[PDB]
Design a protein around this motif. Structure first.
Motif, mmCIF file in Angstrom:
data_model
loop_
_atom_site.group_PDB
_atom_site.id
_atom_site.type_symbol
_atom_site.label_atom_id
_atom_site.label_comp_id
_atom_site.label_asym_id
_atom_site.label_seq_id
_atom_site.Cartn_x
_atom_site.Cartn_y
_atom_site.Cartn_z
ATOM 1 N N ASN A 183 84.013 39.611 52.596
ATOM 2 C CA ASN A 183 85.554 39.695 51.950
ATOM 3 C C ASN A 183 86.462 41.025 52.197
ATOM 4 O O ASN A 183 87.481 40.648 52.797
ATOM 5 C CB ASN A 183 85.643 39.716 50.386
ATOM 6 N N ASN B 186 88.332 44.402 53.772
ATOM 7 C CA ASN B 186 89.377 44.469 54.820
ATOM 8 C C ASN B 186 89.401 46.254 54.929
ATOM 9 O O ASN B 186 88.685 46.800 54.323
ATOM 10 C CB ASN B 186 90.477 43.895 54.186
ATOM 11 N N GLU C 49 92.439 45.992 52.039
ATOM 12 C CA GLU C 49 91.848 45.826 50.718
ATOM 13 C C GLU C 49 91.415 47.207 50.281
ATOM 14 O O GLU C 49 91.576 47.653 48.990
ATOM 15 C CB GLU C 49 90.629 44.718 50.667
ATOM 16 N N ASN D 228 92.615 48.795 46.970
ATOM 17 C CA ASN D 228 91.620 48.777 45.788
ATOM 18 C C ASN D 228 90.836 49.838 45.625
ATOM 19 O O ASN D 228 89.884 50.309 46.520
ATOM 20 C CB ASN D 228 90.911 47.536 45.527
#
Length: 100
Positions: A1, A3, A6, A10
Protein backbone atom coordinates in the motif's frame (compact mmCIF):
# COMPACT_ATOMS: atom_id res chain seq x y z
CA UNK A 1 0.00 0.00 0.00
CA UNK A 2 2.79 2.43 0.99
CA UNK A 3 3.64 5.51 -1.08
CA UNK A 4 5.80 8.61 -0.82
CA UNK A 5 2.68 10.79 -0.73
CA UNK A 6 1.16 8.50 1.88
CA UNK A 7 4.29 8.71 4.00
CA UNK A 8 4.08 12.48 4.15
CA UNK A 9 0.28 12.62 4.36
CA UNK A 10 0.11 10.29 7.33
CA UNK A 11 2.21 10.96 10.40
CA UNK A 12 2.14 7.29 11.34
CA UNK A 13 3.53 6.22 7.97
CA UNK A 14 6.06 9.00 8.36
CA UNK A 15 7.16 7.82 11.79
CA UNK A 16 7.46 4.19 10.72
CA UNK A 17 9.58 5.27 7.73
CA UNK A 18 11.86 7.47 9.83
CA UNK A 19 12.32 4.65 12.33
CA UNK A 20 13.12 2.47 9.38
CA UNK A 21 15.70 5.00 8.12
CA UNK A 22 17.24 5.59 11.56
CA UNK A 23 17.47 1.78 11.76
CA UNK A 24 15.50 1.43 14.96
CA UNK A 25 12.30 0.04 13.45
CA UNK A 26 11.07 -2.42 10.84
CA UNK A 27 11.08 -1.24 7.22
CA UNK A 28 8.20 -1.82 4.87
CA UNK A 29 8.86 -3.29 1.44
CA UNK A 30 9.16 0.21 -0.01
CA UNK A 31 10.49 1.83 3.13
CA UNK A 32 13.41 -0.54 2.63
CA UNK A 33 14.33 0.94 -0.75
CA UNK A 34 13.32 4.56 -0.09
CA UNK A 35 15.62 4.47 2.91
CA UNK A 36 18.51 3.90 0.46
CA UNK A 37 17.85 7.08 -1.47
CA UNK A 38 17.49 9.21 1.65
CA UNK A 39 20.64 7.85 3.30
CA UNK A 40 22.63 8.56 0.14
CA UNK A 41 21.35 12.14 -0.09
CA UNK A 42 22.21 12.91 3.51
CA UNK A 43 25.34 10.76 3.49
CA UNK A 44 26.82 11.72 0.12
CA UNK A 45 24.47 14.23 -1.50
CA UNK A 46 22.73 11.61 -3.62
CA UNK A 47 25.76 10.75 -5.75
CA UNK A 48 24.53 7.28 -6.78
CA UNK A 49 20.91 8.47 -7.14
CA UNK A 50 18.95 8.36 -10.35
CA UNK A 51 16.79 11.37 -11.20
CA UNK A 52 13.60 10.01 -9.59
CA UNK A 53 15.45 8.93 -6.47
CA UNK A 54 16.99 12.40 -5.98
CA UNK A 55 13.58 14.06 -6.46
CA UNK A 56 12.01 11.79 -3.87
CA UNK A 57 14.75 12.29 -1.30
CA UNK A 58 14.79 16.10 -1.44
CA UNK A 59 11.04 15.79 -1.47
CA UNK A 60 11.09 14.23 2.00
CA UNK A 61 14.20 16.11 3.09
CA UNK A 62 12.40 19.38 2.48
CA UNK A 63 9.25 18.15 4.18
CA UNK A 64 11.27 17.31 7.30
CA UNK A 65 12.94 20.71 7.38
CA UNK A 66 9.54 22.37 7.14
CA UNK A 67 7.32 20.06 9.26
CA UNK A 68 9.60 17.89 11.41
CA UNK A 69 12.73 19.94 12.03
CA UNK A 70 13.68 17.66 14.94
CA UNK A 71 13.40 14.47 12.85
CA UNK A 72 15.64 16.32 10.40
CA UNK A 73 18.20 17.32 13.03
CA UNK A 74 18.54 13.65 13.99
CA UNK A 75 18.64 12.39 10.41
CA UNK A 76 21.61 14.55 9.45
CA UNK A 77 23.44 14.03 12.71
CA UNK A 78 23.16 10.27 12.25
CA UNK A 79 24.33 9.96 8.65
CA UNK A 80 26.23 13.20 8.13
CA UNK A 81 27.75 13.97 11.56
CA UNK A 82 30.50 15.88 9.76
CA UNK A 83 28.07 18.26 8.07
CA UNK A 84 28.93 17.52 4.43
CA UNK A 85 25.35 18.16 3.28
CA UNK A 86 23.12 19.45 6.08
CA UNK A 87 23.77 23.14 5.18
CA UNK A 88 23.38 22.65 1.31
CA UNK A 89 19.91 21.12 1.77
CA UNK A 90 18.86 23.69 4.36
CA UNK A 91 19.95 26.38 1.92
CA UNK A 92 17.92 24.80 -0.84
CA UNK A 93 14.99 24.82 1.58
CA UNK A 94 15.47 28.46 2.66
CA UNK A 95 15.69 29.40 -1.00
CA UNK A 96 12.28 27.77 -1.21
CA UNK A 97 10.94 29.95 1.60
CA UNK A 98 11.26 27.41 4.40
CA UNK A 99 12.65 29.43 7.31
CA UNK A 100 15.09 28.03 9.90
Amino acid sequence: NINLDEILANKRLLVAYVNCVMERGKCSPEGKELKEHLQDAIENGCKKCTENQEKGAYRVIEHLIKNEIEIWRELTAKYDPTGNWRKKYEDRAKAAGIVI
